[PDB]
Amino acid sequence: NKCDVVVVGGGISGMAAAKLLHDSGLNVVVLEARDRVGGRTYTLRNQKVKYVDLGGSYVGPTQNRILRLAKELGLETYKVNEVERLIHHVKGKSYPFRGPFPPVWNPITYLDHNNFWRTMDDMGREIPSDAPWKAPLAEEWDNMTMKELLDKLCWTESAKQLATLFVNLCVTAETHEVSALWFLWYVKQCGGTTRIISTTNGGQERKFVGGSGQVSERIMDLLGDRVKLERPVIYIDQTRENVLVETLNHEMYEAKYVISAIPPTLGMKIHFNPPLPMMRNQMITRVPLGSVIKCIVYYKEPFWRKKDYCGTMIIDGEEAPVAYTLDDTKPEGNYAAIMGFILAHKARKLARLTKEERLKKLCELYAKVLGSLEALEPVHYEEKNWCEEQYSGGCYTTYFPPGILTQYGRVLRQPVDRIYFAGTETATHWSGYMEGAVEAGERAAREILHAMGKIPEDEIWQSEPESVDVPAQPITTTFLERHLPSVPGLLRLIGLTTI
Amino acid sequence: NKCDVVVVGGGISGMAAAKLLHDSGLNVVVLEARDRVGGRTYTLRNQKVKYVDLGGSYVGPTQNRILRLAKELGLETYKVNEVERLIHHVKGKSYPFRGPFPPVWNPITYLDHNNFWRTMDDMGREIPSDAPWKAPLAEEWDNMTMKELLDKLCWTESAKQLATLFVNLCVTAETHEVSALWFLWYVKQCGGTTRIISTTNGGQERKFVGGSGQVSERIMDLLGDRVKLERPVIYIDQTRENVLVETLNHEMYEAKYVISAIPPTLGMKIHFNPPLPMMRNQMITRVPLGSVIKCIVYYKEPFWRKKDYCGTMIIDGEEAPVAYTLDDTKPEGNYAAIMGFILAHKARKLARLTKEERLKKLCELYAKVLGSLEALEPVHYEEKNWCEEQYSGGCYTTYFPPGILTQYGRVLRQPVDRIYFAGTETATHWSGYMEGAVEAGERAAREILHAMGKIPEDEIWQSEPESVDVPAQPITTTFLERHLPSVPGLLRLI
Ligand SMILES: *[C]C1=C([C])[C]=C2C(=[C]1)N([C][C]([O])[C]([O])[C]([O])[C]OP([O])(=O)OP([O])(=O)O[C][C]1O[C](N3[C]=NC4=C3N=[C]N=C4[N])[C]([O])[C]1[O])C1=NC(=O)[N]C(=O)C1=N2/[C]=[C]/[C]N([C])[C]([C])[C]C1=[C][C]=[C][C]=[C]1
Ligand SMILES: *[C]C1=C([C])[C]=C2C(=[C]1)N([C][C]([O])[C]([O])[C]([O])[C]OP([O])(=O)OP([O])(=O)O[C][C]1O[C](N3[C]=NC4=C3N=[C]N=C4[N])[C]([O])[C]1[O])C1=NC(=O)[N]C(=O)C1=N2/[C]=[C]/[C]N([C])[C]([C])[C]C1=[C][C]=[C][C]=[C]1
């Protein structure tokens, strides 16, 4: 029954919020809909894999909050293998390379590629992390999809192909599905194109030893019987002195305040009294989550390394089930594995097959790209399709279709009376990651503390010291990168030097 | 507790379904979330207005199922006034006209306008009503907004402004919010641009004497205590022999089958065991409804008719709270009124004001468009903002953003084990309307009858005889309309 704060949701965000409020001497209850905590992170354990993350996994420099939290819970990171060459597979052929960027040799394609990445970043500088609807060209950019934007900017098919893959991999959605404003904000608040795409010095640098599910698992240990499992919340009543929150198994909770720490759309699954205000009522019908299946194929040895390949594959094409892969072997070097993501429309299309049919298709693909018959000989396979989760709605995260971010965006983390909103979607730095879950959980926890007069307004938003274990190298550009023209800028320069 | 069929939803679709099944001798329960039936229709009654529809209202030719159902229930239609001239208000000035379509005088603007409506309709001829995702260029058209489309087709700002108003008014949504495929399907299934936009011979021809809320009210009369009010459904369990359906006030219902007769997205409000399959699980988080406030201003007399105006105004521009109006006076000639819609971003924007602030804005606009100080002097005002409704999600209906109709659209009326899907959004002819509600309610009712062996497969989808009271005149084009070039076609000819 009665407590200080009810947290709806036992994913990283809700658990971080509860822990903070608990740590502050308040009585919290976490109500988790599933028979586990973790939400979009999930470590499966078994003899064949030891452990493996089937959802949220990677951490990297600038992700200082998740790293501080995990370290406090006794967890360690190891670095994702990137010692040997990466592979860009283009028109049925593999081009090994080194560096975070695939080489381009043809100087036109080179200028177009430079300009595109450059422009993503230029455009994002104009977008406030905390209020994207405030950018000078907010409406113009929100009225376009990423598809219209890519069409306008890429004067080569090669750059349009790679840029399309980048969007697919980043937000698990098609270019034509998502707002250009929101996708530009998304990349910008992760610290930019380079930080987001990179393994070394980027978001995929590292993974927790033992899996990321331990973050939520271990907080639940600390909270004990304050975490209630298999309590899906169905009803919130704020008409009375204390807030009433009812679960599906008929239990009633009573708090001073509530943190909603679930995806914004999953708010639909709760009936509200009084009804939500108008803009929230409509916002939650407008914010879908992407589509992905995460796939891990196991082998006897990491045989790719022998050919001087780290196991990272960037795979152009419609034919390819998977556009990107990473070595998923353990830091000890056993349980050799390749991780791959089936994204967006391919998630929807290949869901129709059986587990055995998907495995075969990956192996056959990976045998082509890597040039290795050994890829046809896996020992184990695990996969999770996040599209089927009633209590996620999809993965990695929530995306905004055109016209929504500017009409409805400010509503996302606006309190409704005594409810406050956490969840990775309400973060202003690495929103959509395990990092933004933390930021938002802890932030919404401090908003409630402020409401009670325990802390000043000053202290609701709070900066994080940099990890001494995972420090960030700065993102640098060369002079040529900054000043090489685009294609149309070269064409205009050819136009001028003549007349 | 126990019955043959539980219907989730007390709107026209659910009530039509329940009444069919009831009429067939099955035991039906209708579970209604609100303290009323009707859903997106609502007739408020009072001394000042007598009656007024604050939601769904208009009926016209080719809407033969709503008309058959309401006739059986004892309801009558009257014709929406369109005796005098219409007004197109362009760049701050009112141009009166007769006939469906507002006149275009510039030769080039004429050719561009012609080509645009013509092309809407050409395009839609390639879209199956029951399977839009099957159009030969399904993906191409679904991967574009209406906005990219309009920007490609309209070589004149004038045609692009009117076209934009057209989308706004049709689907309560911005051009950039909606799929091109879905919008072209939408228009196609209402029988084309002319049928949809028209008052005489179109969908705004008629309203019900006494309000359309009587359709749902009177079916609930017939069903009596089978209709359960303030029973929001929260939970559906299909793991056991009979289907279990739980309401928010803790009551449990058990049935052989279930009809879900609610907007597709509002299925989010229900927790399912087993979980929904994957494509439905994700579909219902992708399908929003538009934004509108329906506003009705009352006056002593229908003064516009003295100036030879029917009350229909087409209003270009951003400054305008309302793009379109209709005479809302009663067939008797009293309770003079003008009805307008505040649509899409303007609904979102003007919601922030008070009721009195919105009134003043409408009165001042209408005084301008009509050229009448009498507009500034109303006796009463009523309005409804459908954005605020927890159990509609908006109005008029559900729209598809780009990429959704081709990836998810087949899932809409696919049964999930013993649940069947009704509600206007699943209709194939006038989906969006009071008409599609009936078609889909009766159809999903027939699917369950088939499931039980009471009727053959043959009889699930059923054609409707034409109203003898409201017959349709055919939609005609002239030779010039069909063969006049477009702007680029004339340029290529030059
Ligand atoms: C799915 C996924 C995957 C597959 C992958 C990934 C991911 C995912 N991600 C994401 C994460 O994980 C997230 O963010 C998080 O986790 C979130 O959290 P939160 O906010 O807290 O949320 P959640 O989890 O969901 O929770 C919630 C909870 O609640 C509940 N509920 C519901 N409802 C309800 C409830 N309760 C009660 N009641 C009611 N009513 C549920 O159950 C839960 O529990 C990620 N992240 C990170 O960080 N990392 C990673 O790694 C990840 N992943 C991924 C990614 C990838 N990427 C980025 C890419 C590949 C990269 C690149 C890009 C570009 C180029 C190249 C590369
Ligand atoms: C809102 C509105 C307005 C304002 C207007 C309009 C409309 C609307 N519309 C629509 C109609 O009405 C519809 O469609 C119908 O109604 C539908 O129905 P249904 O399907 O059945 O659905 P609903 O109603 O929603 O119901 C459902 C029910 O359910 C319930 N729930 C929920 N959830 C739940 C429940 N329960 C239990 N549980 C749970 N969970 C609810 O509550 C309900 O009751 C329309 N329509 C027609 O037909 N007509 C008309 O008039 C209308 N309106 C309008 C329109 C306009 N337009 C079209 C325009 C203006 C024309 C034009 C165009 C272009 C150019 C020119 C002109």
Side-chain angles (χ1 to χ4, degrees), chain A residues 1-498, chain B:
Chain A
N1 226 303
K2 309 184 168 183
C3 63
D4 306 305
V5 173
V6 170
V7 185
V8 189
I12 292 167
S13 207
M15 300 303 305
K19 176 174 182 306
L20 195 150
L21 304 156
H22 168 86
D23 277 349
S24 304
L26 299 186
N27 302 314
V28 291
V29 172
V30 177
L31 296 174
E32 170 54 41
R34 292 171 167 111
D35 68 357
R36 58 166 192 90
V37 286
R40 288 170 257 175
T41 68
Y42 176 71
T43 318
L44 162 94
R45 289 104 167 171
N46 72 56
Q47 199 253 7
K48 293 267 164 131
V49 306
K50 167 144 65 189
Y51 62 88
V52 75
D53 292 303
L54 301 184
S57 192
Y58 293 101
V59 279
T62 83
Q63 287 180 7
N64 292 308
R65 284 173 181 97
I66 184 79
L67 287 166
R68 177 264 300 156
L69 177 63
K71 185 190 191 169
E72 188 183 330
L73 295 161
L75 303 182
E76 282 169 47
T77 68
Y78 72 100
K79 278 181 192 163
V80 172
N81 180 77
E82 184 182 55
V83 164
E84 302 92 350
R85 298 173 298 184
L86 303 60
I87 278 168
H88 184 201
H89 187 83
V90 160
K91 261 277 151 155
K93 302 155 97 140
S94 284
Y95 299 94
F97 69 100
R98 312 202 165 246
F101 291 91
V104 39
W105 284 94
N106 174 306
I108 301 303
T109 309
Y110 191 91
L111 296 189
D112 195 38
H113 277 243
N114 188 66
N115 182 255
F116 168 69
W117 298 114
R118 188 176 62 202
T119 316
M120 287 307 289
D121 287 331
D122 286 2
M123 280 185 91
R125 275 170 220 129
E126 288 295 311
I127 296 152
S129 279
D130 67 342
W133 51 90
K134 279 180 161 166
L137 314 167
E139 302 215 324
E140 174 165 332
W141 289 349
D142 201 44
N143 305 351
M144 277 178 237
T145 65
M146 269 315 290
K147 191 215 215 286
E148 332 174 23
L149 186 60
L150 288 191
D151 287 346
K152 188 190 304 301
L153 244 280
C154 297
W155 284 59
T156 66
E157 270 312 294
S158 168
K160 188 197 291 209
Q161 294 164 22
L162 194 56
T164 294
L165 208 155
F166 166 70
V167 182
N168 292 168
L169 206 44
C170 269
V171 296
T172 61
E174 308 288 329
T175 46
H176 61 265
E177 279 173 344
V178 309
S179 159
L181 182 58
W182 168 84
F183 179 74
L184 297 167
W185 164 85
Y186 196 79
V187 173
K188 173 262 179 55
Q189 56 104 42
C190 300
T193 63
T194 308
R195 189 66 78 192
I196 220 180
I197 81 162
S198 285
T199 297
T200 307
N201 208 31
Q204 288 69 240
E205 175 173 283
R206 289 155 188 271
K207 280 166 66 84
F208 297 112
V209 174
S212 76
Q214 304 171 105
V215 163
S216 306
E217 282 162 2
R218 277 166 194 213
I219 303 183
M220 173 184 48
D221 293 353
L222 302 163
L223 297 183
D225 66 72
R226 298 170 185 88
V227 184
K228 316 285 179 205
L229 294 176
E230 304 184 59
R231 270 78 175 181
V233 165
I234 53 163
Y235 179 69
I236 297 191
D237 185 309
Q238 315 191 83
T239 64
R240 272 97 215 277
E241 186 215 287
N242 302 313
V243 179
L244 305 159
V245 184
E246 192 185 2
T247 69
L248 187 72
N249 57 121
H250 288 207
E251 307 182 324
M252 189 66 67
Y253 294 78
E254 211 175 321
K256 310 202 163 68
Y257 304 90
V258 179
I259 288 172
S260 172
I262 62 183
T265 202
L266 302 182
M268 276 304 280
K269 308 198 80 58
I270 303 175
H271 301 233
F272 289 84
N273 184 32
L276 286 180
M278 158 198 59
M279 289 289 283
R280 196 161 191 106
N281 176 49
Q282 277 207 327
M283 187 269 297
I284 51 172
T285 75
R286 276 159 165 78
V287 292
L289 280 95
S291 303
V292 60
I293 314 157
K294 181 180 192 148
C295 305
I296 306 89
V297 182
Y298 298 77
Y299 302 99
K300 208 196 185 154
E301 293 160 10
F303 58 87
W304 47 99
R305 299 175 182 177
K306 290 137 72 215
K307 294 185 148 72
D308 199 26
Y309 298 128
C310 53
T312 296
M313 287 180 267
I314 297 154
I315 305 164
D316 299 321
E318 179 65 29
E319 325 77 63
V322 160
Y324 191 70
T325 65
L326 281 181
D327 193 321
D328 201 48
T329 315
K330 309 272 189 274
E332 293 87 22
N334 36 24
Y335 306 88
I338 298 286
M339 187 281 311
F341 284 126
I342 306 179
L343 306 162
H345 78 288
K346 298 182 184 166
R348 265 105 69 175
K349 181 180 199 265
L350 306 182
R352 289 155 207 173
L353 310 177
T354 64
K355 209 190 168 190
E356 286 81 11
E357 276 168 349
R358 282 175 296 257
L359 175 64
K360 182 175 168 76
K361 279 184 193 291
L362 267 30
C363 290
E364 282 177 1
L365 173 64
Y366 298 155
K368 285 203 257 183
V369 182
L370 287 172
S372 285
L373 294 165
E374 296 173 289
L376 302 175
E377 221 90 338
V379 298
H380 188 67
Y381 173 60
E382 307 278 0
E383 50 164 35
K384 179 155 191 148
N385 185 344
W386 290 86
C387 292
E388 71 195 12
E389 303 296 310
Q390 167 162 228
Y391 294 111
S392 300
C395 259
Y396 327 135
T397 191
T398 292
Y399 74 80
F400 285 62
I404 307 301
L405 191 55
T406 46
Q407 295 293 299
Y408 293 93
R410 68 227 305 143
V411 156
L412 256 185
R413 48 171 189 265
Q414 199 178 72
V416 190
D417 186 19
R418 278 160 290 168
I419 313 175
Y420 288 79
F421 305 94
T424 189
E425 279 93 337
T426 60
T428 66
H429 186 209
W430 295 101
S431 158
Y433 290 79
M434 293 186 278
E435 167 76 14
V438 182
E439 164 185 315
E442 292 183 348
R443 178 227 94 221
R446 303 182 220 100
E447 284 189 278
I448 299 173
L449 284 172
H450 174 69
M452 313 180 319
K454 315 240 163 192
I455 61 162
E457 168 203 280
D458 233 4
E459 280 176 4
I460 295 155
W461 292 91
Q462 177 153 129
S463 79
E464 191 64 28
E466 183 170 286
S467 160
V468 317
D469 303 292
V470 193
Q473 302 266 75
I475 301 302
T476 54
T477 56
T478 65
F479 178 85
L480 288 179
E481 288 165 8
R482 305 198 282 119
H483 301 283
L484 284 166
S486 58
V487 178
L490 177 59
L491 280 172
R492 275 145 133 248
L493 219 87
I494 297 168
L496 266 153
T497 178
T498 60
Chain B
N1 231 306
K2 301 185 168 183
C3 62
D4 304 305
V5 180
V6 171
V7 184
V8 185
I12 291 174
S13 201
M15 293 305 299
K19 175 183 188 292
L20 195 152
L21 300 160
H22 169 86
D23 277 349
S24 302
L26 301 181
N27 308 306
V28 294
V29 179
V30 175
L31 293 172
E32 173 53 31
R34 292 163 165 117
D35 58 2
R36 52 166 200 88
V37 283
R40 288 175 264 173
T41 71
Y42 176 71
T43 309
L44 154 96
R45 280 91 162 181
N46 70 54
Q47 204 246 17
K48 290 269 167 137
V49 307
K50 169 143 70 193
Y51 62 91
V52 69
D53 285 310
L54 300 180
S57 194
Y58 296 106
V59 288
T62 72
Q63 288 180 6
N64 294 312
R65 294 171 173 105
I66 189 63
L67 280 174
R68 180 261 300 161
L69 170 62
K71 195 183 182 170
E72 192 185 316
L73 296 160
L75 305 182
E76 284 167 48
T77 64
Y78 74 97
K79 277 186 190 153
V80 166
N81 176 83
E82 184 186 50
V83 169
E84 303 88 349
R85 307 171 285 184
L86 298 68
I87 286 170
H88 189 194
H89 190 87
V90 167
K91 264 272 158 153
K93 311 141 101 139
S94 273
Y95 298 99
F97 68 105
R98 283 157 191 309
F101 322 124
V104 182
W105 300 112
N106 178 315
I108 298 309
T109 316
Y110 189 94
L111 289 190
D112 202 43
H113 273 237
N114 192 60
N115 180 247
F116 163 81
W117 298 111
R118 177 179 57 205
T119 314
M120 289 313 279
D121 290 328
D122 287 8
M123 291 180 88
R125 271 169 219 132
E126 296 276 351
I127 298 161
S129 276
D130 62 350
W133 54 88
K134 272 179 168 160
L137 313 181
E139 297 219 322
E140 173 156 340
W141 295 346
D142 202 38
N143 301 356
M144 289 184 228
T145 59
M146 258 330 275
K147 198 228 203 278
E148 339 177 22
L149 191 70
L150 294 187
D151 286 349
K152 194 179 315 290
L153 246 275
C154 308
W155 287 61
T156 61
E157 272 310 300
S158 160
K160 194 201 280 201
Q161 311 161 13
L162 186 69
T164 293
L165 219 144
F166 165 68
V167 188
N168 291 177
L169 200 53
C170 269
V171 297
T172 52
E174 310 288 332
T175 48
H176 60 263
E177 284 174 346
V178 307
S179 163
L181 184 62
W182 170 78
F183 182 78
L184 298 165
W185 163 80
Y186 194 83
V187 184
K188 183 256 178 57
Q189 55 102 45
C190 299
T193 60
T194 312
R195 187 68 77 185
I196 225 193
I197 76 166
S198 282
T199 296
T200 310
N201 208 30
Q204 297 60 244
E205 186 179 275
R206 279 152 200 279
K207 304 159 58 78
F208 290 112
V209 178
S212 75
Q214 307 172 102
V215 178
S216 296
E217 290 154 5
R218 283 163 189 216
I219 302 174
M220 172 184 59
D221 291 353
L222 298 168
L223 296 181
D225 69 69
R226 293 164 189 90
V227 182
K228 317 281 177 204
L229 298 178
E230 311 187 59
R231 265 78 171 187
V233 170
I234 56 154
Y235 181 64
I236 302 195
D237 187 305
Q238 313 197 75
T239 59
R240 274 97 216 275
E241 189 215 281
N242 298 308
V243 180
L244 303 154
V245 179
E246 196 184 9
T247 75
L248 190 74
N249 60 121
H250 287 209
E251 306 185 328
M252 191 61 77
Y253 291 78
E254 209 179 320
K256 309 210 172 68
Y257 305 91
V258 179
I259 288 169
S260 172
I262 64 181
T265 200
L266 300 184
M268 281 300 292
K269 308 202 83 60
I270 302 179
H271 302 242
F272 288 87
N273 179 33
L276 286 179
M278 153 198 56
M279 294 292 279
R280 190 166 194 90
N281 176 52
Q282 281 201 323
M283 188 267 306
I284 51 170
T285 71
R286 275 158 164 83
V287 295
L289 279 98
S291 316
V292 46
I293 317 166
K294 177 178 191 131
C295 312
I296 303 96
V297 183
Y298 300 74
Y299 298 105
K300 212 198 185 156
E301 286 159 18
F303 62 84
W304 44 99
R305 296 178 187 173
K306 293 138 76 215
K307 283 187 159 69
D308 197 36
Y309 298 138
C310 51
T312 299
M313 298 173 260
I314 299 163
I315 306 155
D316 301 327
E318 183 60 29
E319 323 80 57
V322 163
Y324 185 79
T325 70
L326 289 183
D327 193 327
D328 201 49
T329 310
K330 306 279 188 249
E332 295 82 22
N334 45 15
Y335 307 92
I338 297 294
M339 182 285 313
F341 285 131
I342 305 179
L343 302 161
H345 73 288
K346 296 188 192 181
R348 262 107 71 173
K349 188 179 199 265
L350 301 181
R352 293 162 204 173
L353 311 174
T354 63
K355 211 198 171 179
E356 291 75 12
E357 278 169 355
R358 269 176 305 253
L359 179 51
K360 182 174 167 82
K361 283 185 195 282
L362 267 26
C363 292
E364 286 176 4
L365 166 67
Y366 298 156
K368 290 206 260 177
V369 176
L370 292 175
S372 289
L373 297 171
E374 290 175 292
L376 295 185
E377 218 88 342
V379 296
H380 189 66
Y381 171 62
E382 304 277 1
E383 52 161 26
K384 194 158 176 154
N385 184 343
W386 287 89
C387 298
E388 77 194 9
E389 296 298 305
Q390 172 166 220
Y391 293 116
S392 304
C395 260
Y396 320 139
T397 192
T398 283
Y399 75 80
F400 291 59
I404 310 303
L405 183 59
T406 49
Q407 288 285 312
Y408 292 96
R410 69 228 311 148
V411 158
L412 254 185
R413 49 178 184 258
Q414 203 174 66
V416 184
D417 187 27
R418 282 159 290 168
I419 308 162
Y420 291 77
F421 304 94
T424 197
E425 283 85 338
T426 56
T428 58
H429 186 210
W430 296 100
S431 158
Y433 298 76
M434 288 184 288
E435 167 68 13
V438 180
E439 165 196 301
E442 291 183 353
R443 176 226 89 235
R446 284 184 229 109
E447 289 186 285
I448 297 175
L449 285 176
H450 176 68
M452 314 180 316
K454 315 235 163 201
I455 60 162
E457 172 199 85
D458 231 9
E459 286 176 5
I460 294 159
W461 291 96
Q462 181 150 122
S463 80
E464 189 72 25
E466 182 163 284
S467 169
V468 318
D469 308 288
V470 189
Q473 306 260 74
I475 299 307
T476 55
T477 55
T478 66
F479 177 88
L480 289 182
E481 295 169 8
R482 304 199 282 123
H483 299 282
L484 282 166
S486 60
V487 178
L490 173 58
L491 283 171
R492 277 146 131 244
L493 216 86
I494 296 167

